[PDB]
């Protein structure tokens, strides 16, 4: 239901982005989270009946996993890129497919743990 969308988006608010980083990177980083996680998971929880309980531990793990995957993407765009000039579009594009795939794996893991029992 709507309340589950709100609780899920509260968790997405905790997936922060460093706005001092290059805009070309930020656009790709944000798109990845939106397309691989925010849209499909919001659609999923919208279906839940009014009193479904979400697992807080599941949500918390999504946050840390995404933050690690995103830092890895940023490293490949910037200070760990050896294939092209650092901070280049070529570094970004070389690191982007594995970023998106890793976010997709987080989606599947999160879907499995999202709901829990009442108590
Ligand atoms: Cl909370």
3D architecture notes:
70% of the residues lie in helices and 3% in strands. It has helices spanning 2-13, 23-46, 56-77, 89-113; strands at residues 53-54, 115-116. The protein is built from four helices and two strands; from the N terminus they run ααβααβ. It is mainly α. The protein has one domain. The two termini are 19 Å apart. A two-stranded antiparallel sheet has the order 1-2. It binds chloride ion (CL). It is classed as protein binding. The entry lists the keywords Inhibitor, complement. The assembly is monomeric. The entry is titled "Structure of a mosquito complement inhibitor from Anopheles freeborni".
Brief synopsis:
This protein is mostly helical.
What order do the helices and strands come in, and which of them pair?
Layout: H1 2-13, H2 23-46, E1 53-54, H3 56-77, H4 89-113, E2 115-116
Helix pairs in contact: 1-2, 2-4, 3-4
């Amino acid at each position: 239901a709507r309340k589950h969308v709100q609780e899920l988006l509260k968790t997405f608010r905790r997936i922060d982005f460093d706005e001092t980083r290059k805009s070309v990177y930020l656009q790709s980083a944000k798109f990845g989270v939106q397309s691989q996680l925010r849209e499909p998971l919001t659609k999923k929880v919208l279906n839940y009946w009014d009193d479904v309980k979400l697992s807080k531990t599941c949500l918390d793990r999504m946050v840390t996993k995404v933050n690690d995957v995103k830092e890895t993407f940023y490293a490949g765009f910037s200070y760990a890129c050896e294939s092209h000039n650092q901070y280049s579009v070529d570094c970004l594009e070389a690191a982007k497919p594995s970023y998106l795939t890793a976010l997709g794996e987080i989606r599947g893991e999160t879907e499995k743990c999202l709901t829990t029992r009442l108590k």
